[PDB]
Design a protein around this ligand. Structure first.
Ligand SMILES: Nc1ncnc2c1ncn2[C@@H]1O[C@H](COP(=O)(O)O)[C@@H](O)[C@H]1O
Ligand SMILES: Nc1ncnc2c1ncn2[C@@H]1O[C@H](COP(=O)(O)O)[C@@H](O)[C@H]1O
Ligand SMILES: [Ca+2]
Ligand SMILES: [Ca+2]
Lengths: 173, 174
């Protein structure tokens, strides 16, 4: 039971765009007792597993993503929306409900043989996490798993991800 | 000399984001577990025993080491962001650039009186953003125990822009 985490999550409708039922985890981030619980819960299924790199998906995935890398004595790799990373990148474009998005990762972020944990605060449709798995694999990384704080269960983002990747979600909202 | 290895790993990318800007890319430090460990240890050396309750990370690139600093210190983490980028109710600080103005924001429930706050960003350049961040934190009632930056662009003299009562620690001078 992780009720203290669940209770702390704020919903802000229409952020950053109308229609999005935004799950704001800043109340968790700001309280060390809850931050501790969140990190422990994210990491639990990955005990005693060699993790070389943690990928944090975009700005809000950098926050717990970095902590995970530090806690695991791993490197940290940012994956970003197109145009945000400074060095040469690999890119993946993907179809949305409406429109398309592109994410990128530095060409030297991941090396063949790296064991990689992919993190984001929230999985919604799973489109971004799917494309991130593709980036990591193109670089020769092996995806040990994805760890999300929150799954938006209604959207069934898990179904968008490939069968071969273990997916851990702490909260089902 | 461990620090010289950090220095050598920093990458400069010309003309990013806007032409003319000499971007300091810290991803080679972030990606290598040994360098990342050294970076965090160096940032925290003056601060480990200071009863810090909150670490502020300034914008996306400050969230990366910023979160690790909070986690390491058993402190809470607070994101500060450009205007409109945070979801909850905010307080805001506008500040002057060389051309025009910028505005940063923080959640109204992020910082309380009594909080002892460390402010982090990967790079300090003009110091405009960190100056405004100090103002935000202070208006919320926090005390800024210090700022910790990985990189100081000493040519831009950002230190001079920060108020004299706030200790400023930088790991690398570039
Ligand atoms: N309701 C939401 N609350 C917070 N973050 C969200 C929400 N929906 C999507 N995101 C984020 O937006 C990006 C797109 O998510 P996805 O639909 O899973 O590809 C990911 O970084 C998600 O974490
Ligand atoms: N040359 C640079 N390389 C990387 N980041 C930078 C550089 N110059 C400024 N920044 C970032 O841009 C923002 C504005 O910096 P400042 O001029 O110190 O207010 C801060 O988040 C800095 O970390
Ligand atoms: Ca360790
Ligand atoms: Ca707002």
């Amino acid at each position: 039971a992780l009720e203290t985490l669940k209770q702390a999550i704020r919903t802000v409708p229409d952020f950053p765009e109308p229609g999005i039922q935004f799950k704001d985890i800043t109340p968790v981030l700001g309280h060390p007792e809850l931050l501790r619980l969140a990190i422990e819960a994210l990491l639990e299924p990955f005990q005693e597993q060699e993790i070389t790199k943690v990928v944090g998906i975009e700005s809000r995935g950098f926050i717990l993503g970095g902590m995970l890398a530090h806690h695991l004595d791993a490197g940290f790799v940012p994956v970003r929306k197109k145009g945000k990373l400074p060095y040469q990148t690999l890119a993946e474009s993907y179809q949305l409900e409406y429109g398309t998005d592109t994410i990128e990762m530095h060409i030297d972020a991941i090396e063949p043989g790296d064991r990689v944990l992919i993190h984001d605060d929230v999985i919604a449709t799973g489109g971004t996490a799917e494309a991130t798995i593709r980036l990591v694999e193109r670089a020769g990384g092996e995806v040990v798993g994805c760890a999300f704080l929150i799954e938006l269960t209604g959207l069934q983002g898990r179904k968008r991800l490939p069968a071969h990747v273990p997916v851990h979600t702490v909260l089902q909202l």
